[PDB]
Structure 1
């Protein structure tokens, strides 16, 4: 409720898109070489960006579920499929009373540009049931999410080839298991890819190792790629490395917890934690496990044995990095001017407002765009659909060959050496180091996920920097990202003849 400065979530993201469209329009028109034209090229380049902004299809459901206590109850649901330029649209299903067609619509677009930035071949999409998961019983929720899967199913809003839902606020591997089981037992009964209809599902259901921690681990990698490039941190008037840094995370949920888990592991210090109901603050730092354990057995962090119940704005906390990890539009124009963190790690979707951005730019703050920072979720989710398609857990088929061959390879150099340096050399044993030893069988699903996310995160980062440079965005990483997210999403459209009218 930011009074002046509580913008329409879809138009906001739409706007962010627009600023990048500015820094690029020309070059789009430029590279564009379509013969007969002048700046007709421009208008073309101009129509396309207009065609990109809006959501293609948005479905609004309303369906009954019989509450445990007899009572019938109509429920609201939405699934916006922003783009198809890449087909399987992807996006999480948010369970919160705060959902709405515009909220989901934006959350959807953020998915399409997000995937662009990180090179994950999906269009964007987003779902949202309008309930408060804490009011329904665990069984009400099954009925609701199983029924919601059926409804989306019969209108083209879910399935391995059209739209692939995943987790978000108040949804996790549980509902992803429910969704997959009613889809695969219903429509996909004959689909060889029946279970790739959703991602973020449990391991026993076809999940992949590292999806729970994925977004956090990505938030972590997002930061590192930037917290270790002096140049940037110098403008930050800070040092390189988490090791001497400090951070405070808003929301202690999926991305929140794990983001804190990873930063902590790399020496960063978590001085504060914000939650729907309250804050915490131990300057001597809080321990991600301890805190999580407490949260686990208290359904709350409030009253953590080792930190005073802080009362203020968790966002206003004094710490090098603030990582918003909950609802959108939190760092608004009315609090931006005092967030006092050098780095804003946008782990949540759309946490900072255009106005707040402006301030951050002025206050000279680096806000790593959610549009790149939380791309760690779709990447690993991509490695899950990929997995599902492959029908094999990584390694199972090669491990042995991989190992045997590897030993032979070494043994080649060995004998090679012995044969020359004969009997004096006598025996020159060639042995894999500790490290290589634990790699002698090749990568496993866990290796691929981690190593993979790491490569994609680091790549999209440099991708963002070059752009930030070429255009002097400086610490305006976002619109540099949009610039990217715009020419990829543009190259597809343009080269497709746009539309069959």
Structure 2
């Protein structure tokens, strides 16, 4: 039977991949959606397709030795998982955070395959990063770390090979140091090697805003599917980094009010809305804690207690990290009348959180659909670079809006095609999978 075939393969996978719970978590949800497609179209398991799909094409782990400002040598671990290249070059971000390990990178890279497929743009899936902690490091220490990291990474990447970008801990600053050092290693100005670049050295307008903006563009599409208006809505946006910052900005441009945001230290309550300019100054100039925002803003309350999800909202947009919204937060959310969740972060909702949303009739936008705005805009940066062109903000934002609407459409149409109307998780996973699978079938056993 199909259900048992897939369950028995998942079991095999758990054995080969012992101790990688985030990867198991990512895989599990996808294969659950894959069961549906195999019942209708069995050829999708032909030629060991699922066995190939779930094993990364290549994984790199490497030493990153570097020297701090006191002349002390440090060693961190670097990673690049090149998961699938059926649709185009490996594509996906780099995360510098002390939590990072191979299992986490594999989870992100596996998800990235289906996210990138969903954009409709020609990009395969990958991810990388390091257990390096950028917090408390000088710009020179960050620079030397990025240079050491790229000293190994450059041989494994390239405009058609693998195109990284930022993620947690890797912003414009780091992409700058990584790109410069890549050019030094390769002796060429290969703009297409990375995305997230600066506007004067091959970057794209809107890329900075893309993930957070598209998240909101997606959530507004789920909201308007219920005959509702995002204007006038109360929104929680967890996190205070690249994705959260611009999610808040688009949200409040659209008539909504963001009532809370957070970092890993705690969360701040803003019942009358966020000052974007203030927050950007605290986070980007001062690289400070959100409590400083509370300290300086009238009526902003810093919290170290409870959770940001204790706030009454109509919409929640988790934009920080994996497993930041759990089963209990999900209940608290629905009890206070939350109506839609859409993920800016990668895999922020736990499995039981997702279960609650279903039980409680909360419309749920999965990250691989909702946050695809980032990588889609990265693919647009790649397109601009490929043609040595530079697009306006308006034109690029318009394309991003079109892609997000296309992703919504695909999720809706496929979910309904397989008898799971309005289940966007089912729609996203099946639609992302089928395009990859068809390409893999066409390109043979490789």
TM-score, length-scaled by structure 2 = 0.89
- Alignment partner of 1:111 is 2:75: no
Does the CA-based 8 Å contact 1:90-1:126 persist in structure 2?
Answer: yes
Q: Does 2:29 align with 1:16? A: yes
Cα distance in structure 2, aligned partners of 1:489 and 1:316: 39
- 1:28 is aligned to 2:38: no
Shift of 1:336: 2.4
Contact 1:315 / 1:324 at 8 angstroms: preserved in 2?
no
Alignment partner, residue 297 of structure 2: 305
Alignment root-mean-square deviation, CA: 1.9
- What is the CA–CA distance in structure 2 between the aligned matches of 1:59 and 1:243, rounded to whole Å? 46
In structure 1, C-alpha distance between the alignment counterparts of 2:150 and 2:140, rounded to whole Å? 15
CA displacement 1:51-89 (0-9 Å, x = unmatched) = 212222110111211111111111111111111112311
Specify which of 348, 352, 355 is matched with residue 355 of structure 1: 352
Structure 1 residues 253-292: Cα deviation after superposition (integer angstroms, max 9, x where no partner): 1000100100111101111112211212132333333433
2: CA distance, partners of 1:339 / 1:174 = 36
SS of 2:92's partner is strand
In structure 1, list runs of 5 or more residues that go unmatched: 1-5, 30-40, 234-238, 395-444
Superimposed CA distance per residue, residues 1-40 of structure 1 (whole angstroms, 9 cap, x where no aligned partner)? xxxxx981111111111012112113333xxxxxxxxxxx
The equivalent of 1:339 in structure 2 is 333
Preserved contact between residue 256 and residue 347 of structure 1 (Cα < 8 Å): yes
In structure 2, distance between residues paired with 1:246 and 1:475: 23
Hey, what does 1:387 align to over in structure 2?
Answer: 384
Question: Which piece of structure 1 moves more, 294-303 or 81-90?
Answer: 294-303
Q: Is the 8 A contact 2:154 2:182 kept in 1?
A: yes
> Equivalents in 2 of 1:28, 1:185: separation in Å?
49
Matches of 2:419 and 2:26 in 1, distance apart? 21
1:428 matched residue in structure 2: none
Task: Tell me what 1:479 maps to.
Answer: 426
Partner of 1:174: 173
State the distance in 2 between where 1:104 and 1:152 align.
15
Look up the match of 2:191: 195
Task: Give the corresponding residue for 1:244.
Answer: 232
Give the SS at the match of 1:267: coil
Distance 1:135 1:286, change over 3 A: closer
Which residue of structure 2 aligns with residue 498 of structure 1? 445
5+ long unaligned stretches in structure 2: 1-18
Find the aligned partners of 1:55 and 1:351 in 2 and give their Cα distance.
Answer: 23
Partner of 1:93: 94
Query: Shift of residue 42 of structure 1?
Result: 6.6
Q: Measure how far apart 1:298 and its partner are.
A: 7.1
Aligned residues of 2:37 and 2:418 also touching (Cα < 8 A): no
Alignment partners' CA distance in 2, 1:61 and 1:360: 40
SS in 2 for 1:309: strand
Which has the higher Rg, Structure 1 or Structure 2? 1
Tell me how far 1:474 sits from its aligned partner: 4.1
Structure 2 equivalent of residue 163 of structure 1 = 162
Write the distance in 1 (CA, Å) between the matches of 2:130 and 2:167. Answer: 11
Cα distance change, pair 43–379 in 1 and its aligned pair in 2 (3 A): closer
Offset at residue 204 of structure 1 (A): 1.6
What corresponds to 2:78 in structure 1? 77
- Give the superposition deviation at 1:101: 0.2
Residues 1:318 and 2:312 aligned together:
yes
Which residue number in structure 2 is paired with residue 264 of structure 1?
252
* Count of residues paired in the alignment: 419
Paired residues of 2:106 and 2:127 also in contact (CA < 8 A): yes
Q: Quote the Cα distance in structure 1 between the aligned partners of 2:319 and 2:152.
A: 30
SS for the counterpart of 1:104 is helix
List per-residue Cα deviations over 1:147-190 (Å, max 9, x = no partner): 11120123x2x211211110100111221111111111222x25
| Structure 1 residues 100-157: Cα deviation after superposition (integer angstroms, max 9, x where no partner) | 0010111111111101111121111111111211132211111111111120123x2x
What is the distance in 2 between the residues matched to 1:69 and 1:165? 31
Equivalent-residue separation in structure 1 for 2:396 and 2:98 (angstroms): 33
Question: Which whole-Å CA distance do the structure 1 matches of 2:85 and 2:184 have between them?
Answer: 26
Give the equivalent residue in structure 1 for 2:393: 446
C-alpha deviation, 1:327, in angstroms: 1.6
| Matched residue SS, 1:270 | strand
Cross-structure match for 2:69: 68
C-alpha contact 2:412 2:423 (8 A) present in aligned 1: no
Taking the aligned partners of 2:106 and 2:287, their CA distance within structure 1 comes to 34
